[PDB]
Scaffold this motif. Structure first.
Motif, mmCIF file in Angstrom:
data_model
loop_
_atom_site.group_PDB
_atom_site.id
_atom_site.type_symbol
_atom_site.label_atom_id
_atom_site.label_comp_id
_atom_site.label_asym_id
_atom_site.label_seq_id
_atom_site.Cartn_x
_atom_site.Cartn_y
_atom_site.Cartn_z
ATOM 1 N N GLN A 124 -14.750 1.338 33.683
ATOM 2 C CA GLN A 124 -15.990 1.223 32.935
ATOM 3 C C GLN A 124 -15.831 1.690 31.493
ATOM 4 O OE1 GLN A 124 -17.851 4.343 35.573
ATOM 5 N NE2 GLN A 124 -18.898 4.762 33.628
ATOM 6 N N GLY A 133 -21.697 4.557 30.190
ATOM 7 C CA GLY A 133 -22.256 5.075 31.428
ATOM 8 C C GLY A 133 -22.820 3.978 32.299
ATOM 9 N N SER A 134 -21.948 3.042 32.660
ATOM 10 C CA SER A 134 -22.304 1.824 33.374
ATOM 11 C C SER A 134 -21.869 1.856 34.833
ATOM 12 C CB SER A 134 -21.693 0.626 32.655
ATOM 13 O OG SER A 134 -20.306 0.845 32.489
ATOM 14 N N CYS A 135 -21.533 3.039 35.349
ATOM 15 C CA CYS A 135 -21.087 3.148 36.732
ATOM 16 C C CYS A 135 -22.058 2.482 37.690
ATOM 17 C CB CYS A 135 -20.910 4.615 37.109
ATOM 18 S SG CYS A 135 -22.452 5.544 36.965
ATOM 19 N N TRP A 136 -23.362 2.636 37.435
ATOM 20 C CA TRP A 136 -24.373 2.024 38.289
ATOM 21 C C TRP A 136 -24.193 0.513 38.375
ATOM 22 C CZ3 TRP A 136 -27.646 -1.366 35.667
ATOM 23 C CH2 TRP A 136 -27.596 -1.292 34.281
ATOM 24 N N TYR A 194 -30.697 2.223 31.864
ATOM 25 C CA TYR A 194 -30.599 2.702 30.490
ATOM 26 C C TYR A 194 -29.263 2.331 29.853
ATOM 27 C CZ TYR A 194 -34.344 5.326 32.636
ATOM 28 O OH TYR A 194 -35.464 5.690 33.359
ATOM 29 N N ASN A 228 -26.280 4.616 29.002
ATOM 30 C CA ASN A 228 -26.764 5.969 29.219
ATOM 31 C C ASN A 228 -27.055 6.230 30.678
ATOM 32 O OD1 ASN A 228 -26.741 6.777 26.438
ATOM 33 N ND2 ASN A 228 -28.610 5.563 26.126
ATOM 34 N N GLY A 229 -26.766 5.271 31.541
ATOM 35 C CA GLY A 229 -26.983 5.431 32.958
ATOM 36 C C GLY A 229 -27.992 4.434 33.485
ATOM 37 N N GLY A 230 -28.132 4.456 34.801
ATOM 38 C CA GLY A 230 -29.019 3.511 35.426
ATOM 39 C C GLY A 230 -28.986 3.653 36.922
ATOM 40 N N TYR A 231 -29.569 2.662 37.574
ATOM 41 C CA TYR A 231 -29.857 2.741 38.996
ATOM 42 C C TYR A 231 -29.189 1.591 39.715
ATOM 43 C CZ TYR A 231 -33.407 5.697 36.957
ATOM 44 O OH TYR A 231 -34.056 6.663 36.229
ATOM 45 N N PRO A 232 -28.273 1.874 40.631
ATOM 46 C CA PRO A 232 -27.742 0.808 41.488
ATOM 47 C C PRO A 232 -28.830 -0.029 42.137
ATOM 48 C CG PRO A 232 -26.538 2.847 41.836
ATOM 49 C CD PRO A 232 -27.737 3.200 40.988
ATOM 50 N N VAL A 266 -23.822 7.377 45.549
ATOM 51 C CA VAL A 266 -23.730 8.238 44.381
ATOM 52 C C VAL A 266 -23.075 9.543 44.796
ATOM 53 C CG1 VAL A 266 -25.718 7.186 43.248
ATOM 54 C CG2 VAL A 266 -26.035 9.208 44.702
ATOM 55 N N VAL A 279 -25.678 14.830 41.863
ATOM 56 C CA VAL A 279 -25.092 13.497 41.794
ATOM 57 C C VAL A 279 -25.344 12.893 40.423
ATOM 58 C CG1 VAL A 279 -25.237 13.221 44.286
ATOM 59 C CG2 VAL A 279 -27.132 12.463 42.839
ATOM 60 N N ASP A 280 -24.312 12.235 39.891
ATOM 61 C CA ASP A 280 -24.347 11.759 38.512
ATOM 62 C C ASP A 280 -23.529 10.489 38.328
ATOM 63 O OD1 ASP A 280 -21.762 12.627 38.716
ATOM 64 O OD2 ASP A 280 -21.961 14.241 37.246
ATOM 65 N N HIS A 281 -22.993 9.914 39.395
ATOM 66 C CA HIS A 281 -21.993 8.861 39.252
ATOM 67 C C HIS A 281 -22.120 7.935 40.444
ATOM 68 C CE1 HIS A 281 -18.469 6.851 37.818
ATOM 69 N NE2 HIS A 281 -17.743 7.156 38.878
HETATM 70 C C1 LIG Z 1 -22.775 6.697 35.659
HETATM 71 C C2 LIG Z 1 -21.486 6.745 34.902
HETATM 72 O O1 LIG Z 1 -21.178 5.705 34.301
HETATM 73 O O2 LIG Z 1 -20.772 7.770 34.923
HETATM 74 C C3 LIG Z 1 -23.922 7.534 35.118
HETATM 75 O O3 LIG Z 1 -24.090 7.387 33.717
HETATM 76 C C4 LIG Z 1 -25.155 7.118 35.924
HETATM 77 O O4 LIG Z 1 -25.630 5.982 35.835
HETATM 78 N N1 LIG Z 1 -25.622 8.046 36.769
HETATM 79 C C5 LIG Z 1 -26.807 7.873 37.589
HETATM 80 C C6 LIG Z 1 -26.387 7.712 39.057
HETATM 81 C C7 LIG Z 1 -27.518 7.826 40.047
HETATM 82 C C8 LIG Z 1 -28.327 6.733 40.335
HETATM 83 C C9 LIG Z 1 -29.365 6.842 41.248
HETATM 84 C C10 LIG Z 1 -29.601 8.038 41.886
HETATM 85 C C11 LIG Z 1 -28.806 9.128 41.618
HETATM 86 C C12 LIG Z 1 -27.769 9.026 40.703
HETATM 87 C C13 LIG Z 1 -27.707 9.088 37.372
HETATM 88 O O5 LIG Z 1 -27.280 10.221 37.604
HETATM 89 N N2 LIG Z 1 -28.952 8.869 36.938
HETATM 90 C C14 LIG Z 1 -29.610 7.607 36.633
HETATM 91 C C15 LIG Z 1 -30.424 7.671 35.347
HETATM 92 C C16 LIG Z 1 -29.576 7.704 34.081
HETATM 93 C C17 LIG Z 1 -28.948 9.037 33.683
HETATM 94 C C18 LIG Z 1 -29.805 9.830 32.699
HETATM 95 N N3 LIG Z 1 -30.181 9.039 31.534
HETATM 96 C C19 LIG Z 1 -30.898 9.482 30.500
HETATM 97 C C20 LIG Z 1 -31.219 8.471 29.424
HETATM 98 O O6 LIG Z 1 -31.279 10.660 30.423
#
Ligand SMILES: *[C@@H](C(=O)O)[C@@H](O)C(=O)N[C@@H](Cc1ccccc1)C(=O)NCCCCCNC(C)=O
Length: 212
Positions: free
Chosen positions: A19, A23-26, A61, A64-68, A133, A157-159
């Protein structure tokens, strides 16, 4: 369900991606579940566009991250293009789905795995790759080079990654950090610890696409 599942051996997993800094892991996570379910239903393994989800999932986002689950809902509601048509650029741009012609594939919905339930996750993995995640921020995860990973890690969880298999003592995970990380891009994470969160929070939030 069997003792071992490995969707790579059924030809349902495409090569490991990187990736990059985005922060496009989702989106990567969602895509490997789409690649898996299309192969399972149609016999064709194709690569699909992480970039399209990056660009087009308005509930996520971008880098900046997102939701699977959001990304998976968008492929159920609209569709997704081949990766070759909509290649990965590592930066959010505008949604270019319309410019790319007809969608290559289309799912029928998104299901959540019952959270905090190892058996429910394994049952889902035995059916198809699953978006999961975990907490990837810890140095132990980042420096993982192989073996069954037990942590240390918390449940922050963050990934998003994709579970593509399991064995007696592990869940097999496709990461999106390139082929140099972990076991050629994969990690085996310990299961069966009685920790309801899963190790590194692995059972927190798991989704898979439905395709009739
Ligand atoms: C993934 C990465 O590329 O490392 C990371 O940026 C991400 O998307 N993390 C998500 C994973 C997640 C999804 C659903 C439930 C729990 C975890 C995450 O931790 N949060 C999703 C919202 C975006 C992250 C925060 N963004 C902002 C703008 O504050």
């Amino acid at each position: 369900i069997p003792e071992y599942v490995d969707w790579r051996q059924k030809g349902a997993v495409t090569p490991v991606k990187n990736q990059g800094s985005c922060g496009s892991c989702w989106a990567f996570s969602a895509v490997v579940t789409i690649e898996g379910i299309i192969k399972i239903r149609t016999g064709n393994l194709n690569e699909y566009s992480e970039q399209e989800l990056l660009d087009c999932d308005r509930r996520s986002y971008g880098c900046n991250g997102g939701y699977p689950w959001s990304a998976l809902q968008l492929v159920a509601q609209y569709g997704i293009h081949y990766r070759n048509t909509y290649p990965y650029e590592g930066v959010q741009r505008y949604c270019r789905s319309r410019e790319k012609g007809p969608y290559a594939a289309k799912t029928d919905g998104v299901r959540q795995v019952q959270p905090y339930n190892e058996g429910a996750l394994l049952y889902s993995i035995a059916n198809q790759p699953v978006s999961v995640v975990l907490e990837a921020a810890g140095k132990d995860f980042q420096l993982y080079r192989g073996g069954i990973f037990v942590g240390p890690c918390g449940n922050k969880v963050d990934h998003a990654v994709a579970a593509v298999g399991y064995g007696p003592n592990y869940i097999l995970i496709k990461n999106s950090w390139g082929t140099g990380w972990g076991e050629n891009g994969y990690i085996r994470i310990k299961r069966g610890t009685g920790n309801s969160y899963g190790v590194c929070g692995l059972y927190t939030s798991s989704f898979y696409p439905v395709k009739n």
